[model samples]
Target: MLVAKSSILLDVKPWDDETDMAKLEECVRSIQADGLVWGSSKLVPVGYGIKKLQIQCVVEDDKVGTDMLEEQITAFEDYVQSMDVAAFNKI
Candidate 1:
């Protein structure tokens, strides 16, 4: 038997140019969930020296949901201003 999974790309935005991106990334990676695996990430330059956090993750459909992921990430209100689903694909 096999379980369905999804690959997701997320764009985490910050409040301002001075926001500590590294710490934001740290906070994102710190989230632990069953059947969730964090993947490679990069910083996307938006404008005015502000950069958005582009991160990827894989999750089992039964064990994780994108909404829950967004909820957790956005919980870090000090670092995460908003979150967007860049892409979501089945795997």
Candidate 2:
């Protein structure tokens, strides 16, 4: 089996420095509605705050590699700052 892990960084601003808590939670939920394994997130601490949604999704494609597998998670690019992916295989 093969797996692809993606680290998605979402650029967002708080209503204020102290009010992004809930919004961050919701945003994560919305982004992770389709993940196989929910990974961790943290504030990139740049700009107001950076929302990072890290996740692992399964890949069936034997052609799976960093570039090809990354495409599976690129759909969120519409709302995120950027998405990065790493691919690994299990023997």
Candidate 3:
């Protein structure tokens, strides 16, 4: 079987004095339960008490050949671009 994984970091801030921690935490938890894994060592402090969130999702399938893996990686890049302001480095 082949495993393709990708990750991205997201920077979020407290909106209107309301922290989005709950929502973010829920999203992370759901992703983890749904097969994604946490890749960041810790919530990186980005100033103002806000932090950077890191997450990764993996797809494991015997059908993911070289071409398919490339396609999946592209899709993963798109997914990260669709997310909030942040930067990512494929590892």
How much lDDT does each candidate structure score? 0.78, 0.40, 0.39
lDDT of 1 by residue, 1-91 (tens): 1368767788988977767877778777888888887877777886658998788877885467768878888877777778888876765
Number of clashing pairs per prediction, in order? 0, 0, 0
Superposed on all Cα atoms, model 3 deviates from the true structure by an RMSD in Å of 8.2
lDDT per residue as tens, model 2, 1-91: 2243333323333334454445544544444333333344445444645444444433233332334323434443444445553334432
| Weakest lDDT window of 10 consecutive positions for candidate 1 | 1-10
In order of appearance, the predictions have TM-scores of: 0.83, 0.32, 0.37
Better of 2 and 3 by lDDT: 2
Candidate 1: give the clashing pairs.
none
Best by TM-score: 1
Q: How does model 3 score by TM-score?
A: 0.37
lDDT of 1 at 2: 36
Off by over 4 Å in 3: 20-23, 32-35, 40-83
Q: Best-fitting candidate, measured by lDDT?
A: 1
